[PDB]
Ligand binder design. Structure first.
Ligand SMILES: O=C(Cc1ccccc1)NCCCCc1ncc(CO)[nH]1
Length: 305
């Protein structure tokens, strides 16, 4: 129908501290979760079946991300490293060293030959996956970097920071193409490209999501009604059924908006702490949500629409 009817299907228990990030594998088979407990867990996407724990970081993990072929993970840790993992073997292939403070956010490019990282050290780093070498250090921001993301052809990087800026970077040169949001405040807590790479979805810590036209540098849509003043809460484009925007909230709910109309079309109740991370399954109408340390669970929700 015109509205989704997401209902709780599974609750995934096992993390012993706050969950930080959940991501579906591109092939749809797996959910990966990262946590302040220093662990990555892999779960069945469709039945929530616990598969394995992946360990090696010396401190908490803020983010995890999948290679395009679903074979590798990269994790971002308070131990100042990223780690590249073979999902099949659970083994650490590379440790990426160079950030001088917590690594907060990470992503592969579509090619999955590069990793982009953002740190509390106010830099964005670009890494070679094959060698684990740092190729470029961008002096991107003047406060912690909250999010980094490649566009669909890999030619662009978008970054966000507590400095209140969203910047777009030329991957090849590392040179800044655009400062898309230029305010002293509020902090920009999350950014990502739209699937078609024309738009940027940006969260600010004034309880606001905004869809920006990258080329024109203009705000096309605003999404409000949720609570976001403190945490770097992920947001998603839901594209498998109706065209939604999805975000967690500091009132312990998952919010779903109609992308075009900006109306709230569902609020998902069940979590007992801040919903820090949501993910949308690549082929099925399935959302994964994850909560901070009062809850420490992941929930899988399914919709007919
Ligand atoms: O959001 C925070 C930072 C914070 C800590 C303490 C107080 C206020 C803020 N931590 C939660 C875990 C990490 C969540 C996360 N990782 C990557 C993203 C978006 O790219 N979001």
């Amino acid at each position: 129908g015109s509205k989704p009817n997401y209902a709780l299907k599974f609750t995934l228990a096992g993390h012993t501290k706050a969950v930080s990030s959940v991501k579906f594998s591109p092939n749809g088979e797996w959910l990966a979760s990262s946590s302040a407990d220093k662990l990555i867990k892999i779960w069945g996407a469709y039945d929530g079946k616990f598969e394995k724990t992946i360990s090696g970081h010396k401190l908490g993990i803020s983010d995890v991300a999948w290679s395009s072929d679903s074979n590798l993970l990269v994790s971002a840790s308070d131990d100042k490293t990223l780690k590249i993992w073979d999902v099949s073997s659970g083994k650490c292939l590379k440790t990426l060293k160079g950030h001088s403070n917590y690594v907060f956010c990470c992503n592969f490019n579509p090619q999955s030959n590069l990793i982009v990282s953002g740190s509390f050290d106010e830099s964005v780093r670009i890494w070679d996956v094959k060698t684990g070498k740092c190729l470029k250090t961008l002096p991107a921001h003047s406060d912690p970097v909250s999010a980094v993301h490649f566009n669909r052809d890999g030619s662009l990087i978008v970054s966000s920071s507590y400095d209140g800026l969203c910047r777009i970077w030329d991957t090849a040169s590392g040179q800044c193409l655009k400062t898309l949001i230029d305010d002293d405040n509020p902090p920009v807590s999350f950014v990502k490209f739209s699937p078609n790479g024309k738009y940027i979805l940006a969260a600010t810590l004034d309880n606001t999501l905004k869809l920006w036209d990258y080329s024109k540098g203009k705000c096309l849509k605003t999404y409000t009604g949720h609570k976001n003043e403190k945490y770097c809460i992920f947001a998603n484009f839901s594209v498998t059924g109706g065209k939604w925007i999805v975000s967690g909230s500091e009132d312990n709910l998952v919010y779903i908006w109609n992308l075009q109309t900006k109306e709230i079309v569902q609020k998902l109740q069940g979590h007992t702490d801040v919903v820090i991370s949501t993910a949308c399954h690549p082929t099925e109408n399935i959302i994964a949500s994850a909560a901070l340390e009062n809850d420490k669970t992941i929930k899988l929700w399914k919709s007919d629409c």
